[PDB]
Coordinates of C-alpha atoms and ligand atoms in Angstrom, one line a residue:
Chain A
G205 CA 141.3 96.1 79.7
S206 CA 145.1 96.4 79.3
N207 CA 147.8 94.3 77.5
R208 CA 150.3 94.5 80.3
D209 CA 151.9 92.6 83.2
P210 CA 149.5 92.8 86.2
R211 CA 152.7 92.8 88.5
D212 CA 153.0 96.5 87.5
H213 CA 150.0 97.3 89.7
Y214 CA 149.8 94.3 92.2
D215 CA 151.8 92.1 94.5
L216 CA 150.7 88.5 93.7
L217 CA 150.1 86.6 96.9
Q218 CA 148.5 83.3 98.1
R219 CA 146.3 80.9 96.0
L220 CA 142.8 81.2 97.4
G221 CA 141.3 78.5 95.2
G222 CA 140.8 77.1 91.7
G223 CA 139.9 74.3 89.3
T224 CA 139.8 73.3 85.6
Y225 CA 137.9 76.6 85.1
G226 CA 141.1 78.5 86.4
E227 CA 142.7 79.9 89.6
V228 CA 142.1 82.8 92.1
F229 CA 144.9 84.5 94.0
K230 CA 145.0 87.1 96.8
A231 CA 147.0 90.2 95.9
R232 CA 147.6 93.7 97.1
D233 CA 147.4 97.0 95.2
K234 CA 151.0 98.5 95.2
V235 CA 149.7 102.1 95.5
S236 CA 146.7 101.9 97.8
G237 CA 147.8 98.9 99.9
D238 CA 144.3 97.4 99.6
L239 CA 143.8 93.6 99.2
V240 CA 142.1 92.2 96.1
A241 CA 141.3 88.8 94.5
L242 CA 142.8 88.2 91.1
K243 CA 141.1 85.6 88.9
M244 CA 143.5 84.1 86.6
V245 CA 142.2 82.5 83.4
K246 CA 144.7 80.5 81.5
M247 CA 144.4 80.6 77.7
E248 CA 145.6 78.2 75.0
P249 CA 147.6 80.0 72.1
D250 CA 144.7 79.4 69.7
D251 CA 141.9 80.7 72.0
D252 CA 139.7 83.6 70.8
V253 CA 140.6 86.6 73.0
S254 CA 137.7 88.6 71.7
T255 CA 135.2 86.3 73.4
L256 CA 137.0 86.8 76.7
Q257 CA 136.9 90.5 76.1
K258 CA 133.2 90.5 75.5
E259 CA 132.6 88.8 78.9
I260 CA 134.6 91.5 80.6
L261 CA 132.3 94.2 79.4
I262 CA 129.6 92.7 81.4
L263 CA 131.8 93.2 84.5
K264 CA 132.3 96.8 83.5
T265 CA 128.5 97.5 83.2
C266 CA 127.1 95.7 86.2
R267 CA 127.4 97.1 89.8
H268 CA 125.7 96.0 93.0
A269 CA 126.6 95.8 96.7
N270 CA 125.9 92.0 96.9
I271 CA 128.1 91.1 93.9
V272 CA 131.8 91.4 94.1
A273 CA 133.2 94.7 92.8
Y274 CA 135.3 94.8 89.6
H275 CA 138.5 96.8 89.4
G276 CA 140.0 95.9 86.0
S277 CA 141.6 93.3 83.8
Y278 CA 145.0 92.4 82.4
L279 CA 145.7 90.2 79.4
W280 CA 149.4 89.1 79.4
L281 CA 151.3 86.1 78.0
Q282 CA 148.2 83.8 77.6
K283 CA 146.8 84.6 81.0
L284 CA 143.8 86.8 81.6
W285 CA 143.8 88.4 85.0
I286 CA 140.6 89.8 86.5
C287 CA 140.7 92.1 89.5
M288 CA 137.8 91.7 91.9
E289 CA 136.9 92.6 95.5
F290 CA 138.6 90.4 98.2
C291 CA 136.3 88.5 100.6
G292 CA 138.5 87.4 103.6
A293 CA 136.4 84.5 104.8
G294 CA 136.1 82.8 101.4
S295 CA 132.9 80.9 100.5
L296 CA 130.2 79.6 102.8
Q297 CA 131.3 76.1 101.9
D298 CA 134.8 76.9 103.2
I299 CA 133.2 78.3 106.4
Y300 CA 130.6 75.5 107.1
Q301 CA 133.2 72.7 106.6
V302 CA 134.9 74.0 109.8
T303 CA 132.1 75.7 111.7
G304 CA 129.2 73.2 111.1
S305 CA 125.5 74.1 110.5
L306 CA 124.4 77.7 110.3
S307 CA 121.6 79.0 112.6
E308 CA 118.2 79.8 111.1
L309 CA 118.9 83.6 111.5
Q310 CA 122.3 83.2 109.8
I311 CA 120.7 81.4 106.8
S312 CA 117.9 84.1 106.8
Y313 CA 120.5 86.9 106.5
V314 CA 122.5 85.0 103.8
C315 CA 119.3 84.4 101.7
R316 CA 118.2 88.0 102.0
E317 CA 121.6 89.3 100.7
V318 CA 121.7 86.6 97.9
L319 CA 118.1 87.6 96.9
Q320 CA 119.2 91.2 96.7
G321 CA 122.0 90.1 94.3
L322 CA 119.6 87.9 92.3
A323 CA 116.9 90.6 92.0
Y324 CA 119.6 92.9 90.5
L325 CA 121.2 90.1 88.2
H326 CA 117.7 89.2 86.9
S327 CA 116.8 92.9 86.3
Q328 CA 120.0 93.1 84.2
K329 CA 118.7 90.1 82.2
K330 CA 121.3 87.7 83.5
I331 CA 120.9 84.2 85.1
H332 CA 123.4 83.0 87.7
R333 CA 122.8 79.3 87.0
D334 CA 124.9 77.9 89.9
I335 CA 123.7 79.4 93.2
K336 CA 125.3 77.3 96.0
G337 CA 127.4 77.7 99.2
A338 CA 130.7 77.5 97.3
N339 CA 129.6 80.4 95.0
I340 CA 128.5 82.7 97.9
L341 CA 131.5 84.7 99.4
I342 CA 131.8 86.2 102.9
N343 CA 134.1 89.1 103.8
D344 CA 135.7 89.7 107.3
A345 CA 133.0 92.3 108.1
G346 CA 130.4 89.5 107.7
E347 CA 129.0 91.0 104.4
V348 CA 127.6 88.6 101.7
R349 CA 128.7 88.6 98.0
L350 CA 128.1 86.6 94.8
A351 CA 131.4 85.9 92.9
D352 CA 129.9 87.0 89.5
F353 CA 126.8 88.2 87.8
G354 CA 126.2 85.0 85.7
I355 CA 125.7 85.5 82.0
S356 CA 122.9 86.6 79.7
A357 CA 119.4 84.9 80.0
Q358 CA 119.5 84.7 76.1
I359 CA 122.2 82.3 75.1
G360 CA 121.7 81.1 71.6
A361 CA 118.5 83.0 71.2
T362 CA 119.2 83.6 67.5
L363 CA 119.6 79.9 66.9
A364 CA 116.8 77.8 65.6
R365 CA 117.2 75.3 68.4
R366 CA 117.5 75.3 72.2
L367 CA 120.5 74.8 74.5
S368 CA 120.1 73.5 78.1
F369 CA 122.9 73.7 80.7
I370 CA 124.6 71.7 83.5
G371 CA 125.7 73.7 86.5
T372 CA 125.9 71.5 89.6
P373 CA 123.0 69.0 89.4
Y374 CA 122.1 68.8 93.1
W375 CA 121.3 72.5 93.0
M376 CA 119.6 72.5 89.5
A377 CA 115.8 73.2 89.1
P378 CA 113.6 70.4 87.7
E379 CA 112.7 72.3 84.5
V380 CA 116.5 72.5 83.7
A381 CA 116.7 68.7 84.0
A382 CA 113.5 68.5 81.9
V383 CA 115.1 70.6 79.0
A384 CA 116.7 67.2 78.2
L385 CA 113.1 66.1 77.1
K386 CA 111.1 69.5 76.7
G387 CA 112.1 73.2 76.1
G388 CA 112.7 76.1 78.4
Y389 CA 114.0 77.4 81.8
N390 CA 114.2 81.1 82.9
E391 CA 115.7 83.2 85.7
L392 CA 113.4 81.4 88.3
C393 CA 115.9 78.4 88.2
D394 CA 118.1 80.6 90.5
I395 CA 115.3 80.7 93.1
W396 CA 115.1 76.9 93.4
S397 CA 118.9 76.8 93.7
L398 CA 118.7 79.3 96.6
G399 CA 116.2 76.9 98.4
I400 CA 118.7 74.0 98.0
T401 CA 121.4 76.4 99.2
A402 CA 119.3 77.0 102.4
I403 CA 119.1 73.2 103.0
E404 CA 122.9 73.0 102.3
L405 CA 123.6 75.7 105.0
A406 CA 121.1 74.1 107.6
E407 CA 122.3 70.5 106.9
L408 CA 125.9 70.2 105.7
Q409 CA 125.0 69.0 102.1
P410 CA 122.2 69.4 99.5
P411 CA 119.5 66.7 99.3
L412 CA 120.5 63.4 97.6
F413 CA 124.2 64.3 97.7
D414 CA 125.1 60.6 97.8
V415 CA 122.9 59.8 94.7
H416 CA 124.6 59.9 91.2
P417 CA 124.1 63.5 89.7
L418 CA 122.4 62.2 86.5
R419 CA 120.1 60.0 88.5
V420 CA 119.1 63.2 90.6
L421 CA 118.3 65.0 87.3
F422 CA 116.4 61.9 86.1
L423 CA 114.2 61.6 89.3
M424 CA 113.2 65.3 88.9
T425 CA 111.5 64.5 85.4
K426 CA 109.3 61.7 86.7
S427 CA 105.6 62.4 87.5
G428 CA 104.9 62.3 91.2
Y429 CA 108.3 63.8 91.9
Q430 CA 108.4 65.5 95.3
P431 CA 110.6 68.5 96.0
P432 CA 113.1 68.2 98.8
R433 CA 112.5 69.3 102.4
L434 CA 114.4 69.9 105.6
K435 CA 114.8 66.5 107.3
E436 CA 114.3 67.8 111.0
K437 CA 110.9 69.4 111.5
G438 CA 111.2 70.6 115.1
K439 CA 114.7 72.3 114.7
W440 CA 113.3 74.9 112.3
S441 CA 110.5 77.5 112.5
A442 CA 107.3 77.5 110.3
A443 CA 108.7 80.6 108.4
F444 CA 111.8 78.6 107.3
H445 CA 109.7 75.5 106.3
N446 CA 107.5 77.8 104.2
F447 CA 110.5 79.6 102.6
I448 CA 111.8 76.2 101.5
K449 CA 108.3 75.1 100.2
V450 CA 107.8 78.3 98.1
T451 CA 111.4 78.5 96.7
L452 CA 111.3 74.8 95.9
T453 CA 107.9 74.8 94.1
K454 CA 108.1 72.3 91.2
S455 CA 106.4 74.5 88.5
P456 CA 108.3 77.7 87.5
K457 CA 105.0 79.4 86.6
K458 CA 104.1 79.2 90.3
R459 CA 107.6 79.9 91.7
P460 CA 108.0 83.5 93.1
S461 CA 110.6 85.9 91.8
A462 CA 113.6 87.3 93.7
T463 CA 111.6 90.6 94.3
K464 CA 108.6 88.7 95.7
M465 CA 110.9 86.5 97.9
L466 CA 112.3 89.7 99.5
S467 CA 108.8 90.2 101.1
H468 CA 108.8 86.7 102.7
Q469 CA 108.7 86.6 106.5
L470 CA 112.0 84.7 106.8
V471 CA 114.0 87.5 105.0
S472 CA 111.7 90.5 106.0
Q473 CA 112.0 89.9 109.8
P474 CA 114.2 92.3 112.0
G475 CA 117.6 91.4 113.4
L476 CA 119.2 90.3 110.1
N477 CA 122.6 92.0 109.8
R478 CA 126.3 91.3 109.2
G479 CA 126.8 90.7 113.0
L480 CA 125.1 87.3 112.7
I481 CA 128.0 86.3 110.3
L482 CA 130.6 87.9 112.6
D483 CA 129.3 85.3 115.2
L484 CA 129.7 82.5 112.6
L485 CA 133.3 83.7 111.8
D486 CA 134.1 83.6 115.6
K487 CA 133.5 79.8 115.5
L488 CA 136.7 79.3 113.4
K489 CA 138.8 79.1 116.6
Chain B
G1357 CA 121.0 95.7 61.3
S1358 CA 118.1 98.1 60.7
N1359 CA 115.3 99.5 62.9
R1360 CA 112.5 99.0 60.3
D1361 CA 109.8 96.6 59.2
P1362 CA 111.4 93.7 57.2
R1363 CA 108.3 93.8 55.0
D1364 CA 109.7 97.1 53.5
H1365 CA 112.2 94.7 51.7
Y1366 CA 110.5 91.3 51.8
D1367 CA 107.2 89.7 50.7
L1368 CA 106.4 87.1 53.5
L1369 CA 105.2 83.8 51.9
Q1370 CA 104.9 81.0 54.4
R1371 CA 105.5 79.9 58.0
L1372 CA 108.1 77.1 58.0
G1373 CA 108.9 75.8 61.5
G1374 CA 108.4 76.4 65.2
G1375 CA 111.8 80.2 67.3
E1376 CA 109.8 80.9 64.2
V1377 CA 110.9 80.8 60.5
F1378 CA 109.2 82.2 57.3
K1379 CA 109.9 81.7 53.6
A1380 CA 110.0 85.0 51.9
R1381 CA 110.9 86.7 48.6
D1382 CA 113.2 89.7 48.1
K1383 CA 111.1 92.5 46.4
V1384 CA 113.9 93.8 44.2
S1385 CA 115.8 90.6 43.2
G1386 CA 113.0 88.1 43.4
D1387 CA 115.3 85.7 45.4
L1388 CA 113.8 83.4 48.1
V1389 CA 115.2 83.8 51.7
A1390 CA 114.4 82.3 55.1
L1391 CA 113.5 84.9 57.7
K1392 CA 113.9 83.9 61.3
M1393 CA 111.8 85.7 63.9
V1394 CA 112.6 86.1 67.5
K1395 CA 109.9 87.6 69.7
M1396 CA 111.2 89.9 72.4
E1397 CA 109.6 91.0 75.7
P1398 CA 109.5 94.8 76.6
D1399 CA 112.4 94.4 79.1
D1400 CA 114.7 92.2 77.0
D1401 CA 118.2 93.6 76.3
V1402 CA 118.6 94.5 72.6
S1403 CA 122.4 94.5 72.7
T1404 CA 122.6 90.8 73.7
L1405 CA 120.7 89.8 70.5
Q1406 CA 122.7 92.2 68.3
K1407 CA 125.9 90.8 69.7
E1408 CA 124.8 87.4 68.5
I1409 CA 124.0 88.7 65.1
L1410 CA 127.5 90.0 64.7
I1411 CA 128.9 86.6 65.0
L1412 CA 126.6 85.7 62.1
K1413 CA 128.1 88.5 60.1
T1414 CA 131.8 87.5 60.9
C1415 CA 131.5 83.9 59.7
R1416 CA 131.2 82.8 56.0
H1417 CA 131.4 79.3 54.5
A1418 CA 129.6 77.4 51.7
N1419 CA 128.4 74.7 54.1
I1420 CA 126.6 77.1 56.6
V1421 CA 123.6 79.1 55.6
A1422 CA 124.5 82.7 54.3
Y1423 CA 123.4 85.6 56.4
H1424 CA 121.7 88.5 54.5
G1425 CA 120.8 91.1 57.3
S1426 CA 118.5 91.7 60.2
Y1427 CA 115.6 93.9 61.2
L1428 CA 114.2 95.1 64.5
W1429 CA 110.6 96.2 64.5
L1430 CA 108.0 96.5 67.4
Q1431 CA 109.6 93.8 69.7
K1432 CA 110.3 91.4 66.8
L1433 CA 113.8 90.6 65.7
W1434 CA 114.1 89.2 62.2
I1435 CA 117.2 87.4 60.8
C1436 CA 117.4 87.0 57.0
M1437 CA 119.2 84.0 55.7
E1438 CA 119.7 81.6 52.8
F1439 CA 116.6 79.6 51.8
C1440 CA 117.1 75.8 51.7
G1441 CA 114.1 74.4 49.7
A1442 CA 114.1 70.8 50.9
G1443 CA 114.2 71.7 54.6
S1444 CA 116.1 69.4 57.1
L1445 CA 117.4 65.9 56.5
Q1446 CA 114.8 64.8 59.2
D1447 CA 111.9 66.4 57.2
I1448 CA 113.3 64.5 54.2
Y1449 CA 114.0 61.0 55.7
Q1450 CA 110.5 61.0 57.5
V1451 CA 109.0 60.7 54.0
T1452 CA 111.8 59.0 51.9
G1453 CA 113.1 56.4 54.5
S1454 CA 116.8 55.5 55.0
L1455 CA 119.5 57.3 53.1
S1456 CA 122.0 55.2 51.0
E1457 CA 125.6 54.8 52.1
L1458 CA 126.8 57.2 49.3
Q1459 CA 124.2 59.8 50.3
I1460 CA 125.3 59.6 54.0
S1461 CA 129.0 59.8 52.9
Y1462 CA 128.3 63.0 50.9
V1463 CA 126.2 64.5 53.8
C1464 CA 129.1 63.8 56.3
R1465 CA 131.8 65.2 53.9
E1466 CA 129.8 68.5 53.7
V1467 CA 129.1 68.7 57.4
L1468 CA 132.7 68.0 58.3
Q1469 CA 133.7 70.9 56.0
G1470 CA 131.3 73.2 57.9
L1471 CA 132.6 71.8 61.2
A1472 CA 136.3 72.2 60.3
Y1473 CA 135.5 75.9 59.5
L1474 CA 133.3 76.4 62.6
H1475 CA 136.0 74.9 64.8
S1476 CA 138.8 77.1 63.2
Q1477 CA 136.6 80.1 64.2
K1478 CA 136.6 78.8 67.8
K1479 CA 132.9 77.8 67.8
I1480 CA 131.3 74.6 68.8
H1481 CA 128.0 73.6 67.1
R1482 CA 126.8 71.4 70.1
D1483 CA 123.7 69.8 68.3
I1484 CA 124.7 68.1 65.1
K1485 CA 121.7 66.0 64.0
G1486 CA 119.5 65.5 60.9
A1487 CA 117.0 68.2 62.0
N1488 CA 119.9 70.8 62.1
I1489 CA 121.3 69.9 58.7
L1490 CA 119.5 71.8 55.8
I1491 CA 119.2 70.8 52.1
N1492 CA 118.4 73.1 49.2
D1493 CA 116.6 72.2 45.9
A1494 CA 120.1 71.7 44.2
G1495 CA 120.9 69.0 46.9
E1496 CA 123.6 71.1 48.6
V1497 CA 124.1 70.7 52.4
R1498 CA 124.1 73.6 54.9
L1499 CA 124.3 73.7 58.7
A1500 CA 121.6 76.1 59.9
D1501 CA 124.1 78.2 62.0
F1502 CA 127.8 78.5 63.1
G1503 CA 127.1 77.5 66.7
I1504 CA 128.3 79.6 69.7
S1505 CA 131.8 80.4 71.0
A1506 CA 133.8 77.4 72.4
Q1507 CA 134.2 79.4 75.6
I1508 CA 131.0 80.4 77.3
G1509 CA 131.4 81.6 80.8
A1510 CA 135.2 81.4 80.6
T1511 CA 135.7 84.3 83.0
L1512 CA 133.5 82.7 85.7
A1513 CA 135.3 81.0 88.5
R1514 CA 133.2 77.9 88.0
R1515 CA 132.3 75.2 85.5
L1516 CA 129.3 75.9 83.3
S1517 CA 128.5 73.9 80.2
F1518 CA 125.7 74.4 77.6
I1519 CA 124.1 71.2 76.3
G1520 CA 122.4 70.0 73.0
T1521 CA 120.1 66.9 72.5
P1522 CA 121.0 63.9 74.7
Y1523 CA 120.8 61.1 72.1
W1524 CA 123.5 62.9 69.9
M1525 CA 125.8 64.1 72.9
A1526 CA 129.3 62.7 73.4
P1527 CA 130.2 60.8 76.6
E1528 CA 132.4 63.6 77.9
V1529 CA 129.5 66.0 77.6
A1530 CA 127.5 63.6 79.9
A1531 CA 130.5 63.4 82.3
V1532 CA 130.1 67.2 82.8
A1533 CA 127.4 66.4 85.5
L1534 CA 130.4 65.0 87.5
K1535 CA 133.5 67.1 86.7
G1536 CA 135.4 69.1 84.0
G1537 CA 134.3 70.1 80.6
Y1538 CA 134.5 69.3 76.9
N1539 CA 135.7 70.6 73.6
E1540 CA 134.9 70.8 69.9
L1541 CA 135.5 67.1 69.4
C1542 CA 131.9 66.6 70.8
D1543 CA 130.6 67.6 67.3
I1544 CA 132.6 64.7 65.7
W1545 CA 130.8 62.2 68.0
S1546 CA 127.4 63.9 67.1
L1547 CA 128.2 63.5 63.4
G1548 CA 128.8 59.7 63.9
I1549 CA 125.3 59.5 65.7
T1550 CA 123.8 61.5 62.7
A1551 CA 125.3 59.0 60.2
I1552 CA 123.5 56.1 62.2
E1553 CA 120.3 58.4 62.3
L1554 CA 120.3 58.8 58.5
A1555 CA 121.0 55.1 58.0
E1556 CA 118.3 53.8 60.5
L1557 CA 115.8 56.7 61.0
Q1558 CA 116.6 57.1 64.7
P1559 CA 119.7 57.6 66.8
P1560 CA 120.8 54.7 69.0
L1561 CA 118.8 54.1 72.2
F1562 CA 115.9 56.5 71.1
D1563 CA 113.4 54.4 73.2
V1564 CA 115.6 54.8 76.4
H1565 CA 114.9 58.0 78.6
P1566 CA 117.4 60.8 77.5
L1567 CA 118.9 61.2 81.0
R1568 CA 119.4 57.4 81.3
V1569 CA 121.4 57.5 77.9
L1570 CA 123.7 60.1 79.4
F1571 CA 123.9 58.2 82.8
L1572 CA 125.1 55.1 80.9
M1573 CA 127.8 57.1 79.2
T1574 CA 129.4 57.9 82.6
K1575 CA 129.6 54.3 83.8
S1576 CA 132.6 52.1 83.7
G1577 CA 132.5 49.6 80.8
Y1578 CA 130.4 52.0 78.6
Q1579 CA 130.5 50.8 75.0
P1580 CA 129.7 53.2 72.1
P1581 CA 126.9 52.4 69.6
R1582 CA 127.3 50.7 66.3
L1583 CA 125.2 50.2 63.1
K1584 CA 122.5 47.5 63.7
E1585 CA 122.6 45.6 60.3
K1586 CA 126.3 44.8 59.5
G1587 CA 125.8 43.4 56.0
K1588 CA 124.0 46.5 54.6
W1589 CA 127.1 48.7 55.0
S1590 CA 130.7 48.6 53.8
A1591 CA 133.7 48.2 56.1
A1592 CA 134.6 52.0 55.4
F1593 CA 131.2 53.1 56.8
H1594 CA 131.6 50.8 59.9
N1595 CA 135.1 52.2 60.4
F1596 CA 133.8 55.8 60.0
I1597 CA 131.3 55.0 62.8
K1598 CA 134.0 53.4 64.9
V1599 CA 136.5 56.3 64.7
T1600 CA 133.9 59.2 65.1
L1601 CA 132.3 57.3 68.1
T1602 CA 135.7 57.0 70.0
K1603 CA 134.7 57.3 73.7
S1604 CA 137.9 59.2 74.7
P1605 CA 137.9 62.8 73.2
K1606 CA 141.8 62.6 73.4
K1607 CA 141.7 59.7 70.7
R1608 CA 138.8 61.0 68.6
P1609 CA 139.8 62.6 65.3
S1610 CA 139.3 66.3 64.4
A1611 CA 137.0 67.3 61.5
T1612 CA 140.1 68.0 59.4
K1613 CA 141.5 64.5 60.1
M1614 CA 138.0 63.0 59.4
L1615 CA 138.0 64.7 55.9
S1616 CA 140.9 62.3 54.9
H1617 CA 138.8 59.2 55.8
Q1618 CA 138.1 56.8 52.9
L1619 CA 134.3 57.1 53.5
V1620 CA 134.3 60.9 52.8
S1621 CA 137.4 61.0 50.5
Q1622 CA 136.0 58.4 47.9
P1623 CA 135.1 59.7 44.4
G1624 CA 131.5 60.2 43.2
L1625 CA 130.3 62.2 46.2
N1626 CA 128.3 65.2 44.8
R1627 CA 124.9 66.9 45.1
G1628 CA 123.5 64.6 42.4
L1629 CA 123.2 61.8 45.1
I1630 CA 120.9 64.2 47.1
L1631 CA 118.9 65.2 43.9
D1632 CA 118.1 61.4 43.6
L1633 CA 116.8 61.4 47.2
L1634 CA 114.7 64.5 46.6
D1635 CA 113.1 62.7 43.6
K1636 CA 111.8 60.1 46.1
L1637 CA 109.7 62.9 47.8
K1638 CA 107.8 63.4 44.5
Ligands
B49_1475 C1 137.5 80.9 106.2 C2 138.8 80.9 105.3 N1 138.9 79.6 104.5 C3 139.1 78.4 105.4 C4 137.8 77.9 106.0 C5 140.0 79.7 103.6 C6 139.7 79.2 102.2 N2 139.0 80.2 101.3 C7 139.8 81.3 100.8 O1 141.0 81.4 101.0 C8 139.2 82.4 99.9 C9 139.3 83.7 100.1 C10 139.9 84.4 101.4 N3 138.8 84.4 99.1 C11 138.4 83.6 98.1 C12 137.7 83.9 96.8 C13 137.4 85.2 96.3 C14 137.6 86.5 96.9 O2 138.1 86.8 98.0 N4 137.1 87.5 96.0 C15 136.6 86.8 94.8 C16 136.1 87.3 93.6 C17 135.7 86.4 92.5 C18 135.9 85.0 92.7 F1 135.5 84.2 91.8 C19 136.5 84.5 93.9 C20 136.8 85.4 95.0 C21 138.6 82.3 98.6 C22 138.3 81.0 97.9
B49_1476 C1 108.6 70.1 51.9 C2 108.7 70.7 53.3 N1 108.7 69.7 54.3 C3 107.4 69.0 54.6 C4 107.6 67.5 54.5 C5 109.4 70.0 55.6 C6 108.9 71.3 56.3 N2 110.1 72.2 56.4 C7 110.3 73.3 55.4 O1 109.4 73.5 54.6 C8 111.5 74.2 55.5 C9 112.2 74.8 54.4 C10 111.8 74.7 52.9 N3 113.2 75.5 54.9 C11 113.3 75.4 56.2 C12 114.2 76.2 57.2 C13 115.3 77.0 56.8 C14 115.7 77.5 55.5 O2 115.2 77.2 54.4 N4 116.9 78.2 55.6 C15 117.1 78.4 57.1 C16 118.2 79.0 57.8 C17 118.3 79.0 59.2 C18 117.3 78.2 59.9 F1 117.3 78.2 61.2 C19 116.2 77.6 59.2 C20 116.2 77.6 57.8 C21 112.2 74.6 56.7 C22 111.9 74.3 58.1

């Protein structure tokens, strides 16, 4: 990247979102006039810039239609600015909080595009680790995009010990919870999270959203633990109930991959296109 | 690193611990080393492992195992390091029983020196415990690695935290299941749990389910653990435990500040205390 003021190339506009992790702002390229998203990562004076730089190189090497495009980065006065593709409708959580439940075909389309993104991430030896409505972006043309590629499947692989992770517990696979008492998870943890995300788009929250997050992880490690299910049987077709059953299979040895899931009836059926989301975006008035 | 068989330079002697480690001897110098072996799959990315190795090459301190080189051969990645003859403190205490207070004080002083270094290099260990603290035949103390960068997933527009063993994790690491993050002071808490582990042979609440231990750390009225038998230990050891086990990371002292504590500043802390403990194995 460059050590320069990003205002040299962009007009900084409205705050789109943020958290403790950092902020994201709308902006416009001064030359082209195209809108972009600018991730702003705040640094402390003693933070190691080289580690941030290393992460950026992953954005420079990975490219896919269903992951937000990367345009460049600016390090300036303890702020790291990352230029990404703008997605006008924000996240699916921003959309379903206004619009209400998504239709079965809208969820089918979302899942297909997210599986295309996951199949790519996984082939590049990355694991997303937090697939959920808030981390799936939608543009004005109704196209689906992941906000990042995740990070390497091998974290601390050279260490003589294992490291587990905590993403958002309601979307975490059982074997990630079990790393607190056993060893190992792999890229299939993202397939379970996609199944919870389908329930989250159908119903307006994931299963057990009112239970404490560490109790949700605890219940997943007990024997006789039953994976979650759609609460209304009649409202959804057999194909959707099966997609939920196979994506939410308890054992990762029996859970299908992103490539295998792209052959499932729910996401292989005709009539899945960006137009179904353009209909969802029309419900904002 | 090299793309060649490590057996070109090393005589492999013994399997040590399962993520596989071998004791070996250098063919030219005759010096013993530990060789870590990582099995790779045909489609694994080589650069990701070699990026990790570089971190190993950049960091150097007496209280972390020395790195000697690496070898890639037929989908096996080998990392050559300093050999620590007595193994881990857990391998030692499972035979010898409880460590003495002076032995614990010397161990903590040495680990704090390693952590102060590790933290100045912007790393976090994330799993300080007896099994991850090595001892050599001379009774010197070494961490088995330098940890990983303090920032993992920093560029992501989301919170993602990487987690060690629940019984040794700080309350703010448990709170990550609800909101926010944590910092390097989580290793100071883990060292306080390790001191109780070396004194009692188990960390606090070892019979409670690991996720239940973490759940209790997020509740209102949570109270940190203490040493069980008050009269066996001096007030300096009780105070060391009290300050390292400060619930709030904002009030918990740094490794540098903990190095001025009476327990680890007292005279007579040297490798001889550990040579005594190693005599109990024989
Ligand atoms: C439907 C609109 N919403 C109300 C319901 C408004 C709230 N949501 C919004 O403003 C919003 C918009 C319009 N874009 C983003 C985020 C990103 C974007 O565009 N490219 C990225 C690339 C990476 C990244 F990590 C985030 C983004 C948000 C949160
Ligand atoms: C006497 C042996 N004991 C039986 C009671 C314990 C068994 N354990 C043993 O033998 C043992 C010994 C003698 N060294 C190690 C490991 C390491 C070593 O030396 N340098 C490293 C550097 C990095 C690392 F990740 C591991 C090691 C073990 C497990």
